[PDB]
Structure formats: C-alpha cells, structure tokens
Amino acid sequence: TASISSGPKHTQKVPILTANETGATMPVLPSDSIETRTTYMHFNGSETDVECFLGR
Amino acid sequence: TASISSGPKHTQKVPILTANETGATMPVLPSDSIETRTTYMHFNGSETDVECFLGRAACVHVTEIQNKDATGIDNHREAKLFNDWKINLSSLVQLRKKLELFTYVRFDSEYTILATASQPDSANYSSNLVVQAMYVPPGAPNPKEWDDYTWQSASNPSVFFKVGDTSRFSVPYVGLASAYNCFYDGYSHDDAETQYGITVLAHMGSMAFRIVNEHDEHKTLVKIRVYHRAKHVEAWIPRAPRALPYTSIGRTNYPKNTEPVIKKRKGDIKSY
Amino acid sequence: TASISSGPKHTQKVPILTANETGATMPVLPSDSIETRTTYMHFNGSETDVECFLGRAACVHVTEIQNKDATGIDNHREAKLFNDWKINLSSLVQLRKKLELFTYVRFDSEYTILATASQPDSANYSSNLVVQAMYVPPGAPNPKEWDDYTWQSASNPSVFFKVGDTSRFSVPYVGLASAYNCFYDGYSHDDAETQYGITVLAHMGSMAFRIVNEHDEHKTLVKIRVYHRAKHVEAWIPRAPRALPYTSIGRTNYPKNTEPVIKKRKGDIKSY
Amino acid sequence: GYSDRVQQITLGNSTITTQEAANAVVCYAEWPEYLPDVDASDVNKTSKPDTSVCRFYTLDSKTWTTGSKGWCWKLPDALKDMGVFGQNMFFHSLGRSGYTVHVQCNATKFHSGCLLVVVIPEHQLASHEGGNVSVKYTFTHPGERGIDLSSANEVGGPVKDVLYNMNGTLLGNLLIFPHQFINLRTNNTATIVIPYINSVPIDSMTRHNNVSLMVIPIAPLTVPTGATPSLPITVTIAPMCTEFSGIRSKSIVPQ
Amino acid sequence: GLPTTTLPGSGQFLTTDDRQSPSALPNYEPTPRIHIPGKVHNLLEIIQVDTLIPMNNTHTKDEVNSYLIPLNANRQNEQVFGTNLFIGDGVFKTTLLGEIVQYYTHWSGSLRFSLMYTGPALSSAKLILAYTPPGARGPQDRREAMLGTHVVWDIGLQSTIVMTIPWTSGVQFRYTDPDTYTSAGFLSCWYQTSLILPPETTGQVYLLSFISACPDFKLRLMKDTQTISQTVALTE
Amino acid sequence: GLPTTTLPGSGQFLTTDDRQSPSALPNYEPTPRIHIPGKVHNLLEIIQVDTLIPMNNTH
Amino acid sequence: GLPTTTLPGSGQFLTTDDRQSPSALPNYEPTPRIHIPGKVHNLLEIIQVDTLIPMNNTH
Amino acid sequence: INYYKDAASTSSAGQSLSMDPSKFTEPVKDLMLKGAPALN
Amino acid sequence: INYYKDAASTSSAGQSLSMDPSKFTEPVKDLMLKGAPALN
Amino acid sequence: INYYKDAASTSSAGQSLSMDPSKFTEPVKDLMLKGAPALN
C-alpha cells in the first residue's frame, strides 16, 4: 500500500479550495499541495478496530 | 565439515605474510604454516547465535512496595504504598554489558515478574496478597494514590497475580525507530543545555505496581523482581566490550580514579 | 526363544572339559551335561539394560540454607545465608557403587530438587519462601552475599521454585571428553605434589542456592535435596564391584583396619 | 602495473592521488547509496545537490608530535561550514549522507610511527565528571577543529583519556570498527568509505552526529636524528550520495 | 473436562526455558525494519576480527604503551617476549577474543597470533615466534624454543606475520578460566638474527601484536563473565 | 491421565489476553440485529471527519 | 482455554517415572563420541564372565 | 478450537478490516469531485 | 503450535545459521587473495 | 511427542536389545569350539 510521487502543478484544477459549508471533509493529501516521493504504509490499523478498542 | 591434510611447502606463495595496515584480518589457518591431518568440526556454533546469547531471562529490576494502613499517609508513592519503574535494561549491569556489544538491537520482550513477601516484624500470619502491575505508556495518567481511578486501567494492559507466584506476558518491540539505540551521540534538539546521550530512542514504556489487598493488622513487605528475555533478536554493528564500571543509566561515563583494568605482569615482558 | 531337549550322550566330544587358563568363559549349558526337556524363556532382560539400571532418580546431595536477618553477618556463606555445591555423583554411596561398575559413562542428567522448610523454634507461622538455584559453570563470578550482582544470573541458567515444591530441569552431557571418567590413573600435570585421581574429566558444573525472600520475624531452615537420574546412558569397560567402604569423593581409598568383607563360615569348608 | 598502492579518487570537481596507499576500507562492506522508497517515511521529495556537495573538503591540518594523544572529529559536524554542504545542512530539517575519508601523513624511510584511523558509528562520549554528568552540545560539536585528546578536561566537555576511547572501552578493541593503520614504513594515507548507518531512514544533521572519525598515534612518532620532531596529519573528507529534505527557515544552534 | 496429572517442576521459572506467552499489546504494529549495514548473527563471526593485545603489561596504570612490544637494535640470540596461553586471563583477557571467551565455559580451536612491525623502512630484522604445546615449560632459550611450532619471520615490505597456534590437544575442549589439566602451552619470540637500524636512526622500535580466532574455533556452555559487577542498581 | 507441567504465569489475569469462557446463560437467544445507519469499524474512520479547533484560546 | 481436571498423584515425584524436562543449557553441543572398546549394554552380559569364589571361607 | 457450545463464549472477534469513512466524511447528496469547484 | 495470535508471543527464534564474517574481517575495497602479496 | 527442542530433554532411551557377551566371555585370539579340546 502512503504517498505517491507527485511533481510541480500549474493547473485550473485546484483540489485544495473547497466549501466546508457542505458538511463534507474532502479527502485532501500531501501530494495535492507539495511535491512528494513514494512511501508505503507498512501498517494496517489493526489496533484501532472497535473490537480491539473495547476488547480489554 | 575443521582441518584438511597438508604437507611440506616450498613456495613463492606465502599466505602468512600480510599487511595489517589494510584493516583486514586475513583468514589464515593451521594448515598454512604447519603440516596437518584431516579432522572434522563436529560442531555448529548453535549457542553463540545472538538469539541464544540474548535469549535467556536476566534480572532487570528489583523494587518494593508494602501493604499497610494508608490512613494519614500524605504521599502513597513515598510510603511505597505503590511504585512505578520506567523500563530500562541498563540499570543492573550483567545484561547491560551483553547488549552493549551491539549498537542497535531489535527484539520482542518476554517479562517474568516474581513477587515474594517478607514480614520483618511480628505477624500472626502471612496474608495472601494480589499484586497488580500496570503498563503505563507515556501520556497516560500516572497513579497518585494506591487506589486512584488510574488503577481501573480500562485502556492500559495490567496483570493481577499473587505474591509468591510469578506473572509472565510478552510485549512486542515497542521502539519508535527500526531498532533501539544502544548508543546515541546526539541530543533531543539543538539546545545548549539539553541532556546528551539519554534518548527516547530506547524508551520501552514504564510499569506501576501496587497490592490490591486492603491492610491487615501487621505490615507486609513485597519485593518485586522483573526478569527480561529477548526473543526474535536482531543486532547490528558490533563494538568494543565495556571495560570500566558503569555509573549511570544511559551515559557511557565511567568513575574517576578507577583502577587499571589490564592486569600487570608479575615479572617481565619475558615472563611466562 | 531356554533349554532344548537333549538325551543320553556317549561321545568323544566333551563340552564340559575346558582350560580356564585361556581367559575365556566357555558357554556351557545344562543340556551339555544332563538330559533336558524343552522350555522357553518367556523373558527379555529388559530391566537389566544399563539405561534402566542407571535411569531412576537417586539422592545425590542434601544441603541447607536459612532465611534470617543478615544484618551484621560478616559472612553470608558461613551463616548458610546461601550455599553452593560442586556437582558430584560420588558423595552419597548408593548411586556411586552403581556407576563405578563401569570405567567411562556418558549420559544426560535430569535433576529434581526438593526443598522443605523447618521452623525449629517458635514461629507464628510458616512463611512462603522461593528458592533460587543458580548453575555456576567454572569461571563465572561466585556469589559472595545472598544478594550480590551474581544472582542477576543474566547469562547463567537459574530456576526459582517454592519451598515444599520441586524443581526439575535436565542438563545435556557437559563432559569435556567423550565420556566422564569414573576412574583416572593420572595427574593434571607432571607435578611432584599434584593431587592424584581427582580430575576435571568428571566435572559437571556446580550449583548455588539461596532464598529470595527477605527475613520475617522468625528464622526458617530450608533443607535442599538434589536427585539425579541418568537418561541416554552409555557405559564402557565393566570393573570389579566396590568391596570396602568409601572415604573420599574421587579417590579409591578405603579405611584402615576395615573389617573382613568375606563372611567367615560357621563350620568347615565341608559345612552346608 | 596496478598496485594496491597507487589510487585516484575523483568526486565532484576534486581529485586525490595517493602513491602509497594500503587498499581502502568500505565500512561493513557496503558502499554509500541513496534512500530507497521502501525504506522512506517522510513524504517530502528530497534534494540531491550532487556535485556541489559531493566533493572533497580538506579540514585544517594537525601536528603529530611525540607528545600527541590523538584527535577526534564528528560527522556531519566537521563539515558544518564547508561550502554548500554546510548551507544545505542548516537549511533542511533532515539530511542523510555517506563519506569518503582520506587521512594523509607522509614522512621518510628513516621515520617510524603508526596511527590508527577508525570510524565509530554512534560514538556517545563520557563526561570526565563521572556519575551522570552530561557532555554539553558545544563540546560534542567542535566543528572542523575536532577534539584534541591531549587538551585539558573542560567543564561540560567529554573525558579525553585515550586508553578508554572516550567511553569506557579499551583502545585495543577499536579494531572491531572499520579502520586502517598509517605505518610510516608502509603506508602514507588511510581511506575509508562510510555508508549511512542509522536506526531511522533520515535524521537531523545538527542534533545527532552519526560517526566520529578518530586518528590516534599508537607507535609514537620517532624522527631521524636531528630531524624536526613532528609531522603534520591532514584529513580530507567528501560527502557522498547526500540528500536533504524538509527545507525551511535555517536552524540556529547553540554557541 | 480432560484428565491431567502435573509433574515435578510445575510452576518453576527456569531463566533458560523458551515458551509462548500472551502479548500484553494485542494487535500492535511494530515499526518497519529499514536496512542497516553491519548485522551480526553469531559471536563466532566477530571473534575472527583481530584486535591488539596489551602484551607489554609491565606498566602500573593502563597506558597506550602496554600495546607496544619494544625491540632493541643489535641484540643477538635473546628473547623478545613470553606469555602462557590462558586466553581467558592475563594479556588476552581484555582483548575482544578474551572478552567473549569469558562468556563461555569451554573453548576449542586454532588461534591466530600476528605481529605488525613499525620500525623505519630502512631497518631489517629476523625474529622467530614459537608455540610450545602443553607438557613442557616455557622455553628458556631459542634452542629450546625452536624445537616446537615456530615461524622465522623476515621483516620486509609485507609488514605483518600471522602465526597460527594450531589446536594441539588430547581432550577436545579446554576451560576458558585457567585450568591445569586443560592448559594450552606457551608462546615466546626471540631474535633470529637481530634488529639493525639504518644510519641517522636510533632507539627502540616496536611491534604491535593482534589476536583473533581461526574458523576452527568452538565456544560452548554460556555463563556469566568475571569482567563486570556492581554494588547498587544504577539510576538515571 | 495425560502428564502436564504448568509454566510461570499460570493463574494470572492479564486484562488484555483473549480466551474462551463458559457462558453463564447456556442456550439463550439474543435479540435479532436490525439495520441502523452509521456503523463505525475503526477509530481511523472517524478521525478523518474534521472538527473545529478552539484556536483563539486566549479567553 | 481447554477444560482439564487433575487426578490423584498430581505433583508427586516418583524416582522411577520417565518424562521430558526443559534443558537448562539450550543449544549446547556435546563432545563428539569417539570409539572405546568394551561397551556394556545389559548386566546380563557381564554376569556370564566367571569369577573366583572364596569357597575356603574358614579364615 | 472452540471448547464451548455457545457463541458468546468464543474469544474476541478479528479485524473488521472494513473501513469506509465516507458515511462520515462525505455524506453529501450530490457527489463532490476533488479538484472540481465545490460550488458551481 | 502457536496458541496465541500475535507474533511477539511465540518462542525464541531458531539459529540464524547465517554467519559471514567478511563484513567485519575483510571490508577492503580491492579484494585480497591469501598467498598473493598484500601490497603490490 | 517431544515438547522440547533439545535432545537432552527427552525421556529415557529404550532397550539396547544389543547384548553380546563375547567381548567379555571369549576374548581369545584363536576361536575355541565347545566340545573340541581346549588345548591341542
């Protein structure tokens, strides 16, 4: 599976401008606004499962 | 698989002359310089594997708590009504010298906790106490009294066992980086007075102990011994073994006016 | 599979006349000299196998340690605050005579350690003590006090069990040679005064015992009994059984003015 | 006619030639390489100035005399002020680098003396005070000057006792670390290639030094009769495969 | 309900046993491993790297000088140094080899002893190193020494000489803590001809000496080292 | 009778262990589940919804 | 957790029982065996060698 | 292996590995594409 | 048989049986052959 | 079933069922046949 590689941008397509009045949290990522390099997650989110959270 | 047979030599090819200035240790064998006969190894080097070397339980900590009437005690922590321990492997030196043969080390821990009771002054009997050991990760509320809401430990792993018995559980490698640093030549930030060497890179959690029992008429001393066994060991970059005595958890410092560590000859260089 | 049927004989072939000077024991049977009938063995000789003969636990050592206030004790070892034992199989004679039927012996050991407590003088109660038995191989630091750094035992196998209980573990054959010498007609070097007979060839390690508990108001005597069972036995070269009493661990010496070991007849050679 | 003996290292816009080498050591048998994605964590694209930072900087020279105890430099500290390497260093949040270290000391066939040149990963120093006294920042960041083991104890500084490596271990066992000797009779330089060694993929270049280079006289310098009793030792070091990441405002560090 | 019987040893804690345990942190995900040069797998890997021996032990406080074996110009027939081979004690004891051997009870195998010469390049020398196998005394003169394992070393361009102490033994293991029955011999070194310095040169020259184990080597039965102890627990 | 040995840790209660237990109510039948909008499975699902920060903390 | 019941005899030590035990020295390698003439396997092997009888016991 | 008959007696459940924040993060009636204008 | 779910809870690891001293004993850049001259 | 890893930890060995007294009862160099004269 955490960040893809992304480079300079000069577009008409701006993912960082939104309207929060709508009630959504738009899924913006580091790569929408800076230049990133690939990295992997190495993680599953196992210990935040509700079974785990309420299970001790 | 130890020595091959080898006979007289009169060559232009001399394996025993080398240049140590290069930094290599050339792999010279008995058969390069005497006449040998075949012999087999009969041995694998099993018990020198690092998993084996670091894999037996070592005592890492001895603490003590007491069961007594807390009535009128203004500071439970101070009366040893309960006690914490920030986990370390560098306070008792036996295991410490072993680990510091390496620079970075990675392993799961298996803890065994033995608890025995003492009744140094007149008691009718020996009571049966249950100890509670709570694992308190950094950021959790810390116990203030021996019976705080903290001990509810609703999200924090805790084990309850009886004094005289042993408790045993195993914790995965909790380091923040890829390995634990046995050494760190750095600071936590570029501060002019921040501490040197001691780092979170080594941090393994922390543990709080208490007796669950209320008090009987006599007082009971319970002494806790924590044992630690590394399992699934991985070690990188060997270093020179520790020669001088240790003075502090986490610094390399040795004591002043220490004694010569190399044994002086009783005789000459020429002596046997 | 014990006797075949055999009838009258009038031969030139006499199996019962031999020459013992040769050193052989000729395999003569009932059927060589009387008339027999067939009978079967019905038996295998199972319980005379050397694995069986040396394979049951035998008491090899009884020692004793006490739990008491060490305050002001200048010599813990001397107060039986703790105690060592250099492992042996020749101090209690029952098992010793059995092993010395052979010259070289090779086996794994299974140890059982029973610990019971005694309170010879007025106590309110019986405390519950945990014993620690440390295996101290030659070259390890030896305990000096009952709570030295030694007891950390970070590299040395140690077992913790409760008084009244038993501890059990098994140690591989730790001999330096291919077998343990039950006997050794040699010295450690050609010295004019070095000891004769006693050898490292027999060395099996050594063991140190202590109570982990601090002291209660009374004193408690704990007496340790070590049992040893040979498993995976291999024995070479049978010898004459021991006739006279033993005097020392590791020497063959018998006591002076000992008594006749052969029972004198009450009567003649002719007596029944 | 290639000898182990003559060598040329060209890195960037700078070249070194030695006509009296004794092979070269590559720490742990690994050559410096950039940070692979599979090992990456920070999502930032990194900056690789290449030839402007990966060239040879020659630190100021030392003087070996019969009384010398040895010198110690820390990396990347020693280079904190060299050209654009240094700027990059103070300006990014994180950086990573390997190095080629070339230590030089020539004499004549009448001199004797032998230096140990060793690289120690994570050399945490000891306070000469004992106990749990710390070693202040400035003291472990001597810069190009390095630490002079024959200088006096100072307050908040490290211990400078050579038989103990500045940490409670014996000089004799430093040989377990990548190292090379300079024996006037054999050798005139020592070269060690250092791959990046850390427990994290990239780190801060200012709060943590990841190797100390140490040059220690072991067989004392002995000059021919009526020779001047000393020789200079020069250290030239080149960052290799350097990467910087997390650019911003420019760190301010004590002193 | 399945019927069981518990055996002797139940409830004991043996620091050397290896079993499963519940994880206190169910479901936790450890940090990924990244690559780090230098991984060690066996202590046998590292005792083959040679380290310096403080052979010149004759000082009174630890000094860089006890690593230096001195050589005198123009002496003939004489002896350069001597030592027994109790690798767990004496000169050997602080070396990495000595230091690891001390974590085990028994050792077997060949040792590699080398000497690197540091004298001016225009000097010359011929030394003899001799290994004396157990059973005889430390040699008292070269004649005595030369009848056992030996190497005539000719000091040249090639600066180091590697002598091997081949495993000579009845019993297949020796004790690391010095023991008689189990003893390994002596190592001595003498002038074969003599050190000669060039003109304009003077004084003593020194040899550095190293020790490491051959690939031959075996160590077994781990135990605690006499090389480290303590009187109270340390704190931060 | 099968021979056993008990290990260190026997009888301990670790609040984080996960094992089977006898049911006190053998054979009881729980109420059927009906559908309810909004099921959460991971705390990671919810920390992606944004909420307001009291940035102006100065009161 | 599997349900068990312990029988009479639990915890006893019978010097003649034969069971497994943990090794105190995990991973240790014993010295190789070499050949030695004379191996004995059964006491029945040796009681077939004849030995002298002190028949004249009258001393 | 379950040793017991009832389902309540089994150990903890196993990770949903479900994970779909959109019911919480994007419950809008007309779909919003990142990059397209929020309000047209 | 593992009785437990997590990997940390398993017993000790099993012998590397890796063993390669050359990173420590021969980290030289140009390969040295035993028997050939050290310095050419 | 061995529950333990090391060989020393296994139970007792099992009967040699070897049994050959001739090394002890007839170690003579020239073979003696029962019934034939001992000394020829």
UniProtKB/Swiss-Prot annotation, chain D:
It is found in: Virion; Host cytoplasm. Interacts with capsid protein VP1 and capsid protein VP3 in the mature capsid. Forms an icosahedral capsid of pseudo T=3 symmetry with capsid proteins VP2 and VP3. The capsid is 300 Angstroms in diameter, composed of 60 copies of each capsid protein and enclosing the viral positive strand RNA genome. This is Capsid protein VP2. It comes from Human rhinovirus 14 (HRV-14). The chain holds residues 77 to 331 of 2179 of the full protein.
Curated annotation (Swiss-Prot), chains H, I, J:
Disulfide bonds: none annotated. It comes from Human rhinovirus 14. This is Capsid protein VP4. Lies on the inner surface of the capsid shell. After binding to the host receptor, the capsid undergoes conformational changes. Capsid protein VP4 is released, Capsid protein VP1 N-terminus is externalized, and together, they shape a pore in the host membrane through which the viral genome is translocated into the host cell cytoplasm. Coiled coil: none annotated. Myristoylation is required during RNA encapsidation and formation of the mature virus particle. Interacts with capsid protein VP1 and capsid protein VP3. The chain holds residues 30 to 69 of 2179 of the full protein. It is found in: Virion.
